[PDB]
Paper text:
To assess how microtubule binding influences this [name] NF conformation, we also determined the NF structure of the full-length MD, (1–565) by cryo-EM, while bound to a microtubule. Three-dimensional (3D) classification of the cryo-EM data resulted in two distinct classes (1 and 2) of [name] decorating microtubules, with one class (class-1) containing the majority of the particles (66%). Overall resolutions of 3.1 and 3.2 Å were obtained respectively for classes 1 and 2, with 3.4 and 4.0 Å respectively for the kinesin part. The two classes differ mainly in the orientation of the MD relative to the microtubule so that the minus subdomain in class-2 is positioned further away from the microtubule. Also, the switch loops (L9 and L11) are well resolved in class-1 but not in class-2. Given the further separation from the microtubule interface and the lack of ordering of the switch loops usually associated with microtubule binding in other kinesins, class-2 likely represents a partially unbound intermediate. In both classes the MD is in an open conformation. Note that relative to class-1, the class-2 [name] MD is rotated and the areas of the minus subdomain that make contacts with the microtubule in class-1 are further away from the microtubule surface in class-2. For the lower resolution class-2, the map was postprocessed in Relion, applying a bfactor of −80 Å2 and low pass filtered at 4 Å.
Residue numbers in the entry:
A (entry chain K): 59 to 106, 113 to 230, 286 to 320, 327 to 365, 374 to 410, 414, 422 to 515
B (entry chain A): 1 to 441
C (entry chain B): 1 to 429
Write the structure that this text describes.
């Protein structure tokens, strides 16, 4: 690619009335432009670095004026197209308390986040060009399982059990490809993978034929339309501001299955990984994973065409980077969604989050500091 | 009344405590049993001084000290050694697991659930004083408890009491000799503690004391039992004025006032002149002038630095034994005459003098000759900047490649904190370079 | 308190365990009957590290015998120290793997692993504060590789905080009496890289070399090799049990030795070692021990360290000594041989000192190395592995056990990546 690195995108959460009631507004978050976020310290005269201004590069920045759907329509819809066009894409998400990441990605049903809108766009696009029933499972990005009658019925029973126990992209091929769209949802917690679509009541890793790691015995669920996917995802969410304590990975695989029943058609994968931002143990593990992840991303940014050196990407040091080895390697590509908040109480965490997750981070200092 | 609570943290702390309390018991004639035969012999006086010993009804004198290790191997020696019956049973061992040369474990994870006991015991000790206070905390940089738990304890003490002098006696890493490979991380991570909380920190370096022992004491193969004795001699000399009569007694407040020009420059060096072996005790007069000159010799300093590379911002001399003001004034005039000793232009006086009539004692089985007089010099200088610079370089040589970082990150220490610590150190260095500058008219 | 749960699997593991328990019971003065008849009180100060207290003033080691198949049970139970072990820990099956990793991992081992896990859980529940587990086994064999890795994985899943320490015997490159060493060794290394805190690579070739050249033995046998390995393994954990001027433990060594999570393969060594007839000619000084440690011919890993760079080393000395002499000698080693140490570590040496020597010696000391030269042994195995795998020499003995061929390829790739990782740090940078 053209040194794409990550192409990070930023959301800035608006203030809430209860937050303004407590004078949380002290100008923590602002923008020099849509590309460079500016983070400044609040005037923390309390408790008896006047600005400490930091700048963070992003592919695009979206202020409080930009809603969830406004965010999706500007950045991620293309990536959805890019997946169904024939690519494989992975959207990381990061943020801290009050950042709005759990509302940016999931959100409500009306001001839908990136995840429900990805569901909406993809499933509405492929109506009239999908297989009515399950016929072919996307186990791997380069392998599938053809399902006999009993297997198809069993998968339908799985989908119905998960549903019962508590708009367009350039792709348009009716009567040529009976698309088979399947979804999955799990989480990495304490370096253990837990399948989450299994309704409320540990997964393993192994490589494919080309050495790409994948997760074993993942409860892939065939889906017909938007609402089935959203309901399955919502039920799976219960097994996982309110923020995660684990790295929750949702994924969708579309089989471009021609009418002849082509085995191993083009498998198009879109995945989203919501990342957790001194409960001690998990916290250390979270930090450990994030640390490894940062190194990997740094390597992935250091090993672009800007250096033309590969060095080592330490993706083997964690489950999170190992399962996403294919995207560090080149079998897929990845981008980032960062969330922040202008509240004073969040500032330090927010700042750290940007320093972890921005496309690039620099110190401005705000030289007007050193007043005294 | 005048009392000081001795806190010791970590193995270096505990061993220094053993040597120190041996020296104190010898000075006050207190047996290992805590009984004091001189009480019935004299029948009066406060020779069981309250500065280091609390007296109970039975005539037993209990030390005023508490100390922790998070490793029962070291404190169990005290619990079984000759002084097991001296110390109170409250020697807080809690080391079901050690910190293992890890600042994060000492500060964030393992140190929790022990700091409460230590603070409770220190509160109980502090409630027994009707008078002056000041804590003497002993530890070692580069270790576990000495680096993390010490920071936690200082942070809690500065809130619970606040306006109490907290003297720090810390083992610093040597330029070359080191017993660990993660030493620079744990050393740098304590700069925030040593800046914001400590009121005066005395650094010593093991390589310098090895040089002194090999050269002056004529000990080919020294071990920790001698370095601890020398450090104990230093600490006894500092607190001599609180116990024994003297022509000029300097308290801790007047001690800190004349030695710390600014809030952020509280890092004096220390040295002790009459090191002198037993055989060399003859053939030398050891007059006041000789020891005063010997204190300024760079080869006799306890930190591997060179005062000639910097300027002397303050100096305090504490004399013991047969010392008369006439000779002290003559020696100080001679020192001011010499051009090898450079004083900053903004400190015209430069000297604080304290004289005590109690001559030093000699530990049985020791290696220091009995002398009539002795002197301990403390000096706030800019050359100490060197002792930081080397360490900072070592830190960088690791942190550029994130070596050993994950061992901390898994313990709840945010990575960015590392950078913050180094920044504080950087600021400190600049401050010293900004006080060695001659005034401009 | 800091207790250790000792586990051992396979013939090699059980024999090393027998020699090790003999040495430890000698160190603490414990009779074969389990009673104590020593002299110094320090023996009972920290006897809880290895032994539980049984009611009759008796001491029982925390040893768990994994697949002590009757051929080895008859040896251990009827040996000199057969009666020291509590019979409930003699866990074993019948019809062992027979030099087949798949049988040791999937087919036969999965049937027996439950009993061993139950015994381990019962033993661990009795500890006041467990420090870590200590495993002894051999790669390239049968049950020792398969079940060894299975137990490592499951125990580490059960007890993630605690230190998983492994003492494993590698397959020698040349002196081998088993055809299918490469497959079992490769799969075992693939399982070992991700599931242990520190692994000590021992090779029979190096031990034979030490016995022939240093001790001047003419007819060495497996007893002597176990003697050397037991001496090392006692030396490693000496600081947990006895006081010293500078203390250390397993976690302290792990912190000061593993610069990155995957670089935890070590080269053990021990000193002094010399034949009886020459012992009168050489005096024991810290210079002599330091000279003998870093001599390339004393290493037990069968790899010359000079082909690469030391990531980091550690010396654990035992006996009364001066700290200045130790520090001077280690600094001299770093300065003189600076070409063989990594530049971007200011100080590559960890030091620990215990003041209780072995029973019959004034002074002793144990070396642990960590150098990129170790990559060599992996390369050799990989070469032999591919030399079979491309021809499918013996895959039907494995694929018949419900093992897909893919499990081989992954393991091979993993080993290569490990080698590549070490090769990153051989170059000056
Ligand atoms: C009598 C005499 O002159 O020989 C000594 C001896 O010191 C020598 C020859 C010993 C002796 O060792 C050997 O000959 C040997 C042969 C094969 C493999 C290993 C050793 C000795 O066996 C070993 C034994 O060492 C001990 O007692 C240590 O405590 C040792 N004990 C055991 O290994 C042990 C063996 C059987 C039963 C119980 C304990 C030890 C070492 C490290 C950690 C713990 C314990 C000693 C003093 C001797 C003999 C007996 C000949 C040496 O061994 C050790 C490990 O110290 C070989 O060179 C070293 C040091 C000496 O040169
Ligand atoms: N001068 C002097 N230094 C000592 C003494 N004992 C230990 N040290 C120093 O302590 C430093 C490392 O501290 P540690 O051995 O880790 O002991 P610690 O500081 O309590 O940390 P822990 O390992 O958790 O106990 C080394 O650099 C030693 O030189 C001593 O008796 N005298
Ligand atoms: N050091 C040592 N190695 C041994 C001993 N006995 C066997 N071995 C090695 O162990 C390997 C055989 O492994 P084995 O114990 O049979 O595996 P198992 O079948 O699962 O028990 C061979 O390569 C031998 O070199 C011993 O007493 N000492
Ligand atoms: Mg310790």
């Amino acid at each position: 690619d053209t040194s794409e690195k990550v192409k990070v995108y930023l959301r800035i959460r608006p203030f809430l009335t209860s937050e303004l009631d407590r004078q949380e507004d002290q100008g923590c978050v602002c923008i020099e432009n849509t590309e460079t976020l500016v983070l400044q310290a609040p005037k923390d005269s309390f408790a008896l670095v006047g600005q400490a201004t930091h700048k963070f590069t992003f592919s695009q920045i979206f202020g409080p004026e930009v809603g969830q759907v406004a965010f999706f329509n500007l950045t991620m819809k293309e990536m959805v197209k890019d997946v169904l066009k024939g690519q494989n894409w992975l959207i990381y998400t990061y943020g801290v308390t009050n950042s709005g990441k759990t509302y940016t990605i999931q959100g409500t049903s009306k001001d839908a986040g990136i995840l429900p809108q990805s569901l909406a766009l993809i499933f509405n696009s492929l109506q009239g060009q999908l297989h009515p029933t399950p016929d072919l499972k996307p186990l791997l990005s380069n392998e599938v399982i053809w399902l006999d009658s009993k297997q198809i019925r069993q998968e339908e029973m799985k989908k119905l059990s998960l549903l019962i126990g508590g708009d367009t992209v350039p792709v348009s091929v009716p009567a040529d490809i009976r698309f088979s769209v399947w979804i999955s949802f799990f989480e990495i917690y304490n370096e253990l993978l837990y399948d989450l679509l299994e309704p409320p009541s540990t997964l393993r890793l192994c490589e494919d034929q080309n050495g790409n790691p994948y997760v074993k015995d993942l409860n892939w669920i065939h889906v017909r339309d938007v609402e089935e996917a959203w309901k399955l995802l919502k039920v799976g969410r219960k097994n996982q501001q309110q923020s995660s304590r684990s790295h929750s990975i949702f994924s969708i695989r579309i089989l471009h299955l021609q009418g002849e029943g082509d085995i191993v058609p083009k498998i198009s994968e879109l995945s989203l990984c919501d990342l957790a931002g001194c409960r001690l143990k998990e916290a250390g593990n979270i930090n450990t994973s994030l640390h490894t992840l940062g190194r990997c991303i740094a390597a992935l940014r250091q090993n672009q065409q800007n250096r033309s050196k590969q060095n080592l990407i330490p993706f083997r040091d964690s489950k999170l980077t190992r399962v996403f080895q294919g995207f560090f390697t080149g079998r897929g590509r990845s981008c980032m969604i960062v969330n922040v908040n202008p509240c004073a109480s969040t500032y330090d965490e927010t700042l750290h989050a940007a320093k972890f997750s921005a496309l690039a981070s620099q110190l401005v200092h705000a030289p007007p500091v050193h007043l005294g | 009344m005048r009392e000081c609570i001795s806190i010791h943290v970590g193995q270096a702390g505990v061993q220094i405590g053993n040597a120190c309390w041996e020296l104190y018991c010898l000075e006050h004639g207190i047996q290992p049993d805590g009984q004091m035969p001189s009480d019935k012999t004299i029948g009066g006086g406060d020779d069981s001084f309250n500065t280091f010993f609390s007296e109970t009804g039975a005539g037993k004198h209990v030390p005023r000290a508490v100390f922790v290790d998070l490793e029962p191997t070291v404190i169990d020696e005290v619990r079984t050694g000759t002084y097991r019956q001296l110390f109170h049973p409250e020697q807080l061992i809690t080391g079901k697991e050690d910190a293992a040369n890890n600042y994060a474990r000492g500060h964030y994870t393992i140190g929790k659930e022990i700091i409460d006991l230590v603070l409770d015991r220190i509160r109980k000790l502090a409630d027994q004083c009707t008078g002056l206070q000041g804590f003497l905390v002993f530890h070692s940089f580069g270790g576990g408890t000495g680096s993390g738990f010490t920071s936690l304890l200082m942070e809690r003490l500065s809130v619970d009491y606040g306006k109490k002098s907290k003297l720090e006696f810390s083992i610093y890493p040597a330029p070359q000799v080191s017993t660990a490979v993660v030493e620079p991380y744990n050393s740098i991570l304590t700069t925030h503690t040593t800046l914001e909380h400590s009121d005066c920190a005395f650094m010593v370096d093991n390589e310098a004391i090895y040089d002194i022992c090999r050269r002056n004491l004529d000990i080919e193969r020294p071990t920790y039992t001698n370095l601890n004795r020398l450090i104990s001699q230093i600490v006894s000399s500092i607190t001599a004025s609180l116990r024994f009569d003297g022509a000029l007694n300097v308290d801790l407040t007047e001690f800190q006032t004349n030695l710390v020009p600014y809030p952020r420059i509280h890092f004096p060096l220390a040295t002790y002149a009459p090191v002198i072996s037993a055989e060399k005790a003859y053939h030398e007069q050891l007059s006041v002038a000789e020891i005063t000159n010997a204190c300024f010799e760079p080869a006799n300093q306890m930190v591997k630095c060179d005062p000639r590379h910097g300027k002397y911002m303050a100096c305090c001399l504490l004399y013991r034994g047969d010392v008369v003001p006439k000779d002290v004034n003559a020696a100080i005039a001679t020192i001011k005459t010499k051009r090898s000793i450079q004083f900053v232009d903004w400190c015209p006086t430069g000297f604080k003098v304290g004289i005590n009539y109690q001559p030093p004692t000699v530990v049985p089985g020791g290696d220091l000759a009995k002398v009539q007089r002795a002197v301990c010099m403390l000096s706030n200088t800019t050359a100490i900047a060197e002792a930081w610079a080397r360490l900072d370089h070592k830190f960088d040589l690791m942190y550029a490649k994130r070596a050993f970082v994950h061992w901390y990150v898994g313990e709840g220490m945010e990575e960015g904190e590392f950078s913050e610590a180094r920044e504080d150190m950087a600021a400190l260095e600049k401050d010293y370079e900004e006080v060695g500058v001659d005034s401009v008219e | 308190m800091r207790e250790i749960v000792h586990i051992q699997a396979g013939q090699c593991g059980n024999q090393i365990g027998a020699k090790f328990w003999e040495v430890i019971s000698d160190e603490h003065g414990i009779d074969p009957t389990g009673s104590y008849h020593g002299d110094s009180d320090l023996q009972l100060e920290r006897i809880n590290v290895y032994y539980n207290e049984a009611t009759g003033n008796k001491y029982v080691p925390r040893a768990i015998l994994v697949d002590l198949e009757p051929g080895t049970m008859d040896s251990v139970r009827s040996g000199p120290f057969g009666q020291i072990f509590r019979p409930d820990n003699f866990v074993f099956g019948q019809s062992g793997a027979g030099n087949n990793w798949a049988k040791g991992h999937y087919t036969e081992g999965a049937e027996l692993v439950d009993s061993v896990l139950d015994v381990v859980r019962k033993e661990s529940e009795s500890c006041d504060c467990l420090q870590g587990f200590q495993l002894t086994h051999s790669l390239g064999g049968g049950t020792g590789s398969g079940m060894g890795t299975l137990l490592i994985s499951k125990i580490r899943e059960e007890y993630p905080d605690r230190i998983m320490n492994t003492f494993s015997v590698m397959p020698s490159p040349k002196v081998s009496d088993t055809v299918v060493e490469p497959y079992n060794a490769t799969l075992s290394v693939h399982q070992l890289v991700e599931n242990t805190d520190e692994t000590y690579c021992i090779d029979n070739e190096a031990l034979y070399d030490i016995c022939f050249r240093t001790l001047k033995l003419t007819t060495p046998t497996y007893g002597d090799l176990n003697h050397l390995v037991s001496a090392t393994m006692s030396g490693v954990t000496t600081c947990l049990r006895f006081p010293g001027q500078l203390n250390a433990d397993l976690r302290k060594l792990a912190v000061n030795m593993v610069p990155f999570p995957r670089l935890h393969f070590f080269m053990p060594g021990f000193a002094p070692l010399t034949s009886r007839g020459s012992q009168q000619y050489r005096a024991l000084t810290v210079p002599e021990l330091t000279q003998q440690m870093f001599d390339s011919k004393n290493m037990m890993a069968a790899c010359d360290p000079r082909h690469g760079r030391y990531l980091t080393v550690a010396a654990i000395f035992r006996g009364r000594m001066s700290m200045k002499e130790v520090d001077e000698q280690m600094l001299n080693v770093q300065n003189k041989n600076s070409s063989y140490f990594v530049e971007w570590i200011p100080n590559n040496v960890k030091t620990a000192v215990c003041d209780i020597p072995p029973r019959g010696l004034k002074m002793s000391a144990t070396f642990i190395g960590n150098s990129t030269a170790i990559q060599e042994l992996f390369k050799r195995i990989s070469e032999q592995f591919t030399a079979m795998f491309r021809r499918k020499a013996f895959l039907h003995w494995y694929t018949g056990e419900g093992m897909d061929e893919m499990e081989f390829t992954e393991a091979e790739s993993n080993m290569n990546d490990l080698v590549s990782e070490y090769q990153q740090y051989q170059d000056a940078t």
